Amino acid sequence: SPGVVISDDEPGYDLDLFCIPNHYAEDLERVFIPHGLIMDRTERLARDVMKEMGGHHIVALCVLKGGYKFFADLLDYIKALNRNSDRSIPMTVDFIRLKSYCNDQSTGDIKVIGGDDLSTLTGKNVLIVEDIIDTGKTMQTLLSLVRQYNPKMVKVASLLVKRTPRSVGYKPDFVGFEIPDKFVVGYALDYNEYFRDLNHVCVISETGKAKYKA
Amino acid sequence: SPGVVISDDEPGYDLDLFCIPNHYAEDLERVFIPHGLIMDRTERLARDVMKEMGGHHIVALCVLKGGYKFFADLLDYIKALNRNSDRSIPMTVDFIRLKSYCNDQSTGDIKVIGGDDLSTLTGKNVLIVEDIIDTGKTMQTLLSLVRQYNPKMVKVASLLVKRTPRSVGYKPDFVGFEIPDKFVVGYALDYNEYFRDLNHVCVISETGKAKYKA
Amino acid sequence: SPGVVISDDEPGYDLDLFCIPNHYAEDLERVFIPHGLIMDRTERLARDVMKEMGGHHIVALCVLKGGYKFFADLLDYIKALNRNSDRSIPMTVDFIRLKSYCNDQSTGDIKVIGGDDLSTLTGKNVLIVEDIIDTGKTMQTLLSLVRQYNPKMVKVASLLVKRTPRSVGYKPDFVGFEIPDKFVVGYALDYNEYFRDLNHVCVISETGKAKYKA
Amino acid sequence: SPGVVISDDEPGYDLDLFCIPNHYAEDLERVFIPHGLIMDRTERLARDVMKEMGGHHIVALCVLKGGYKFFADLLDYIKALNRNSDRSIPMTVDFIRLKSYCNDQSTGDIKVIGGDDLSTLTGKNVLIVEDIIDTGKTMQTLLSLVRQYNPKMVKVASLLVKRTPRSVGYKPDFVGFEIPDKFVVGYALDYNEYFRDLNHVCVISETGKAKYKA
Ligand SMILES: Nc1nc2c([C@@H]3N[C@H](COP(=O)(O)O)[C@@H](O)[C@H]3O)c[nH]c2c(=O)[nH]1
Ligand SMILES: Nc1nc2c([C@@H]3N[C@H](COP(=O)(O)O)[C@@H](O)[C@H]3O)c[nH]c2c(=O)[nH]1
Ligand SMILES: Nc1nc2c([C@@H]3N[C@H](COP(=O)(O)O)[C@@H](O)[C@H]3O)c[nH]c2c(=O)[nH]1
Ligand SMILES: Nc1nc2c([C@@H]3N[C@H](COP(=O)(O)O)[C@@H](O)[C@H]3O)c[nH]c2c(=O)[nH]1
Ligand SMILES: [Mg+2]
Ligand SMILES: [Mg+2]
Ligand SMILES: [Mg+2]
Ligand SMILES: [Mg+2]
Ligand SMILES: [Mg+2]
Ligand SMILES: [Mg+2]
Ligand SMILES: [Mg+2]
Ligand SMILES: [Mg+2]
């Protein structure tokens, strides 16, 4: 499945219809995926993960920085299931930071800003949690590093998957939303480190990208 | 504003993409407004209410049974604002229950199944909290009833407003979502008492319509 | 089980440690039961209910006005279980109002301000949801009324149970907290209709009792 | 403010009163600080942070892995204030991983696994978010590292502060709870990587210590 498909027509929502930080209004064009919707979709994704890896101990690997919010929420929903059902996915949490984007584009060079503690993943079931699959370079690179160590199994959950001509074609195991070729921010996703402190996933305005341009 | 407008050519979301009670699986067609989206819009509605009435003491009147969820959540968001800024809108709460629907049509006979404690509304600023304005008979009836007690002011917040030829033309002061002419259920809104125990506002299938038909 | 037992020697927390509505600042003495603690306890109560009535269709009956918050939250947790497991407690909802308190004491006279439609309880499994059992007059009156309609089974859930000499000794099927003989407000529990718009269950100050005295 | 002071003989709660992960049923002794209580305290902490640094651009620095849950939640509450008031603390978010514990013991040798990014802190207002101050060694080392790059200002928010003779005597700027000399787990706080996937802060059972010992 492709997840919740947001066609290139979806108009999104007027900023005035929700609560958005005033210091960002100037720089945002529309609310694209409201936080509450992300939550509802993530609750389902958590049940999907539980069905797929339920009877196993897992190592949840958070791809910093962009995946931090999705990582926290996805694990909370899995935790909810773990304490309210017969099913139980015991979890250990790991973090790794990869960097390669400047402005609204990938530089093509993915760097591991530390956390290559991937050697401990040998024989383990790994659940990688990322914010968005764009060109697919980051995940392609991450998967290469992880597989190096022979983990028992590796699954990838990405909140978003972008429909772009630049995509390598990589598809995650779990996907919240499939979106158009627009640079989105919010929910931990940034534009040169800004907009991470934003509840909803929005689209940056032209004046916004210009103002925060590197 | 007319709120968040959901167009006629909008097919909602696949039930498959969310978590819905299995005991309702075949009874629903699609998810129309995810719970989280309702919360996000309700958060903004609370700020708008406080902006308009936040300067005074308010009496929140809940229109049972359908408005119970929206009433609870809207008040919670208003309380969140109250305890996180000097901006305070003291609130007292009241409930009145009106009945007139059978299956998916209004009998045209709006019965007050308990609710004349309305005398306590005299001289007060009233915020009526309702689930949906359809033909408008209910709210028209309620407004007439409340006006009999001379409140200081009366404002109405309805989570939904349906675009239907059957409407009287009434428009609330606050509106969450403007929807197509479809009988929705969930979020305390029912179909012959069922579907109230449902997080998301959904469209009732034909099998559900028959299964729970009065 | 007696629920979470709070001893007579427990004073609660300084108002300074939490966020509380500014308009009630001087009217409250201490935070007695943090909202989040109520939520955590309610979550287990929802699992307990599911374990006792899960195999059946239930009619949740809300005792207005004080039980409205506990009713909304308990049902929300029950719903959460319902959409994340084959275990499904399908439920319909009803509301009933019982008035008898003036200031911080019962007036003896218990008026059932709306409740002829309890006939819908006939032959069904009922879950009564109430805020607090004090003298026991209210619940006693309610149980008698409901029995008149011959329901299949009745179970009561009370957020609080007060340790007081005035109590008749009634014990609910589910209890959140067993508290000392103090007049608490907040979480929908009032003092002459005030303090319902309060997240935490708190103890009133003498100034609050005096200022809102009736 | 010294935060919520938890007494030496604090009993905590029977696990049977809350919902805990099945895989930890025999590994915990008591629920020490309920998740909901942590949330309530964190809400106030966010308002306190906003009161002290609300008029400026702040860099929130998460001390991994322990402070990941507190960091997410504290920032979420700050964001809630940011999108609902005139005051806005635009935040950028950074992470730094420090490691020094084995079982329930501090090796005294702190390792900086990833965070050199600290050069970007020059002339910025830094809010360090940590899980707990025990011996004080970790925060001591961190402030030294951060201060090396001349930040405009640095404040420390620690969810917990342990009363221990081993303590150096460091006092954070914001403190959630001051606890007795016990090795707590949960809410991202681990015991050899275990117990992070647990919502409540609990005390470890004797069987848990032996099963998860390093
Ligand atoms: N805010 C915001 N970040 C990204 C990214 C960042 N780049 C990475 C994915 O890149 P790629 O697939 O191109 O290798 C992710 O880790 C993500 O954080 C890609 N597309 C967007 C986008 O549209 N918006
Ligand atoms: N579940 C579900 N309830 C209603 C109602 C109920 N009828 C009332 C509004 O009716 P009207 O405007 O026609 O008088 C509301 O109180 C609402 O509870 C109208 N339309 C719908 C609908 O599409 N779905
Ligand atoms: N706010 C606040 N309400 C009540 C009540 C109200 N009275 C009813 C119970 O009364 P009784 O058992 O005494 O007959 C409940 O419906 C409850 O709402 C009792 N004690 C308190 C209290 O300490 N505080
Ligand atoms: N789970 C759990 N972790 C810690 C720690 C970890 N050690 C660090 C603080 O140690 P110190 O002050 O001794 O240097 C923190 O980063 C914290 O994660 C100290 N005490 C406890 C405790 O009681 N429980
Ligand atoms: Mg990234
Ligand atoms: Mg980025
Ligand atoms: Mg109605
Ligand atoms: Mg109805
Ligand atoms: Mg009552
Ligand atoms: Mg009362
Ligand atoms: Mg640590
Ligand atoms: Mg640790």
- D93/A114 Cβ within 8 A: no
- Yes or no: say if C157 and C171 are a contact pair by the CB < 8 Å rule: no
Question: Which backbone phi and psi does D60 adopt, to 5 degrees?
Answer: -85, 125
Ligand 9 centroid to C189 CA: how many Å? 7
Classify strands D201-204 and D28-33 as parallel, antiparallel or unpaired.
antiparallel
Binding site membership of A178 for ligand 1 (Cβ less than 6 Å): no
Q: Which two tokens stand for residue A33?
A: 């995926």
Distance from CA of D49 to the nearest CA of B (A): 12
Question: Does residue A65 have a cis peptide bond before it, meaning omega lies within 30 degrees of 0?
Answer: yes
Q: Which two tokens stand for residue D155?
A: 């404040």
C170 C-beta closer than 6 A to ligand 3: no
Closest CA to B32 of B196, B170, B203: B203
Amino acid at D159: L
Alpha-helix runs per DSSP H in chain A: 22-25, 35-53, 68-82, 137-148, 206-211
Nearest-atom index, ligand 3, CA of C98: 16
Mutation target to probe the A interface, by most A beta carbons within 10 A, among C41, C47, C77, C84 is C84
- C chain contacts of residue A43, beta-carbon cutoff 8 Å: 84
A36 closest CB neighbour out of B13, B17, B40:
B40
Angle value at C-alpha B183, between B178 and B188, nearest 5 degrees: 85
Return the closest-CA partner of residue C140 out of C104, C108, C116: C108
- Among positive and negative, which fits the CA dihedral D6, D12, D18, D23? positive
Query: Pairing relation of β-strands A105-112 and A125-133?
Result: unpaired
For residue D73, what are the domain limits? 1-214
Give catalytic status of residue D76 as yes or no: no
Is A43 annotated among the ligand-binding residues? no
CA D45 – CA D42 distance, rounded (Å): 5
Residues of C in contact with A80 (CB under 8 A): 80, 84
Strands D153-162 and D125-133: parallel
CA distance B35 to D195: 31
Q: Specify which residues B30 forms β-bridges with.
A: B203
Output the CA D179–ligand 4 centroid distance in Å.
12
Residue B153, SS3 per DSSP: strand
CB contact under 8 A, B34 and A40: yes
Quick one: closest CA in B to C94, which residue? B65
CA distance C154 to D150: 67
A-chain CB neighbours of B37 within 8 Å are 34, 36-37, 40
Phi-psi region of A187 (alpha: psi -120 to 50; beta: other; left: phi over 0): left
**B79, B46 in Cβ contact below 8 A?**
no
C65 lines ligand 3 (CB under 6 A): no
Nearest CA, atom 20, ligand 2:
B134
C176: left (phi over 0), alpha (psi -120 to 50) or beta: alpha
d(CA B187, CA B202): 9
Q: What is the 3-state secondary structure (H, E, C) of C156-201?
A: EEEEEEECCCCCCCCCCCEEEEEECCCCEEECCECECCECCCCCCE
Q: Is the CB of A197 less than 8 angstroms away from the CB of D79?
A: yes
Resolution (A): 2.0
Contact check, Cβ <8 Å, B19/A44: yes
Q: Nearest-CA distance from B44 to chain A in Å?
A: 5
Which are the catalytic amino acids of B? 134
For residue C54, the 8-state DSSP code is T
Please list every protein residue whose CB sits less than 6 Å from any atom of ligand 2: B 63, 66, 100-101, 106, 130-138, 183-185, 189-191
CA-derived radius of gyration, chain A: 17
Could you give the CA distance from residue B139 to residue B157 in angstroms, rounded to a whole number? 11
Please tell me whether the peptide bond between A111 and the residue prior to it is cis, using omega within 30 degrees of 0.
no
Is A190 annotated in some ligand binding site? yes
What values do phi and psi take at C165, rounded to 5?
-65, -25
Burial class (CB in 10 A: 0-12, 13-18, 19+), C111: exposed
Query: Measured between CA atoms, how close is A175 to chain C, in angstroms?
Result: 19
Cβ contacts of B85 on chain D, cutoff 8 Å: 84-85
Helix (H, G, I), strand (E, B) or coil at B74: helix
Question: The domain spanning residue B205 has which CATH number?
Answer: 3.40.50.2020
Please check whether residue A141 is in contact with residue A110, taking contact to mean a CB–CB distance below 8 angstroms: yes
Which of C88, C92, C117 is opposite residue B21, by nearest beta carbon? C88
Residues of B at the annotated binding site for Mg(2+)? 190
Chains touching A by CB (3 or more pairs below 8 Å): B, C, D
The A201-204 sheet, strands edge to edge: A28-33, A201-204, A184-185
Q: State whether the beta carbon of A101 lies less than 6 angstroms from ligand 1.
A: yes
User: Which residue type occupies C18?
Assistant: F
Which residues are C52's β-sheet partners? none
Ligand 7 centroid to Cα of residue A6, in Å, is 33
Q: For residues D185 and D191, is the Cβ–Cβ distance under 8 A?
A: yes
Longest dimension (CA), chain B: 52
Helices (H) and strands (E) in chain A, counts: 5, 10
Q: Does the beta-carbon distance from D35 to C36 stay under 8 Å?
A: yes
Cα(A35) to centroid(ligand 8), Å: 29
Contacts of B210 (CB under 8 A, 6+ apart): none
For residue D81, which residues of chain B lie inside 8 Å, CB to CB?
Answer: 84
Residue C176 backbone phi and psi in degrees, to 5: -80, -60
- Tokens describing residue B131: 């689930």
Closest CA to A49 of A71, A78, A69: A78
User: Is D64 in contact with D190 (CB distance < 8 Å)?
Assistant: no
For ligand 11, the distance from its centroid to the CA atom of residue D152, given in whole angstroms, is 25
Does ligand 3 come within 6 angstroms of the Cβ of C190? yes
Q: Please state how this structure was obtained.
A: X-ray
Q: How far apart are CA B170 and CA C79, in angstroms?
A: 33
Give bridge partners of residue A91 from the DSSP assignment: A58
Residue C208 amino acid letter: G
φ/ψ bin of D108: left (φ > 0), alpha (ψ from -120 to 50), beta (otherwise)? left
What is the number of structural domains in chain D? 1
CA D158 to chain centre: 5
Pairing of strands B91-102, B58-64: parallel
Contacts D85 to B, Cβ<8 Å: 84-85
Give φ, ψ of C208 to 5 degrees: -65, -40
Q: Which atom of ligand 4 is nearest to the CA of D67?
A: 18
Phi, psi (deg, nearest 5) at residue C123: 75, 10
Positions of E strands within B14-54: 28-33
Residue A62 near residue A94, CB atoms below 8 Å: yes
Q: How far apart are CA C183 and CA C134, in angstroms?
A: 10
How far separated are the first and last CA of chain C, in Å rounded? 37
Chain B closest-CA separation from residue A160 CA (Å):
14
Q: Distance between CA atoms of A106 and D53, rounded to whole angstroms?
A: 34
Judged by CB atoms closer than 8 Å, whether chains meet at C18 and D47 is answered as no
Task: Compute how many other C-beta atoms are within 10 angstroms of the C-beta atom of residue A18.
Answer: 24
- Identify residues of B whose CB sits under 8 angstroms from chain A CBs: 1, 3-4, 13-14, 16-19, 34-41, 43-44, 47, 199-200
* Sequence-separated (6 or more) residues with CB below 8 Å from residue A41: A3, A4, A176, A177, B17, B18, B34
Round to whole Å and give the CA distance between C1 and B213.
Answer: 41
Ligand nearest the Cα atom of residue D169: 4
How far apart CA A85 and CA D132 sit, in angstroms, is 31
Judge if the upstream peptide bond of residue B51 is cis by omega within 30 degrees of 0: no
Strand-pairing partners, residue A149, are none
Peptide bond into C111 cis (omega under 30): no
Rounded to 5, what percent of chain D is helix, strand, coil? 30, 35, 35
Closest-CA residue to A140 (of A103, A179, A166, A114): A166
Assigned token pair, B63: 């229109």
Report the chain B residue with the minimal C-alpha distance to residue A36.
Answer: B36
> What's the rounded Cα separation, in Å, for the pair D143 and D63?
11
CB atoms within 10 A of CB B11: 10
Q: Do B80 and D85 touch (CB under 8 A)?
A: no
Residues pairing with C33 in the sheet: C201
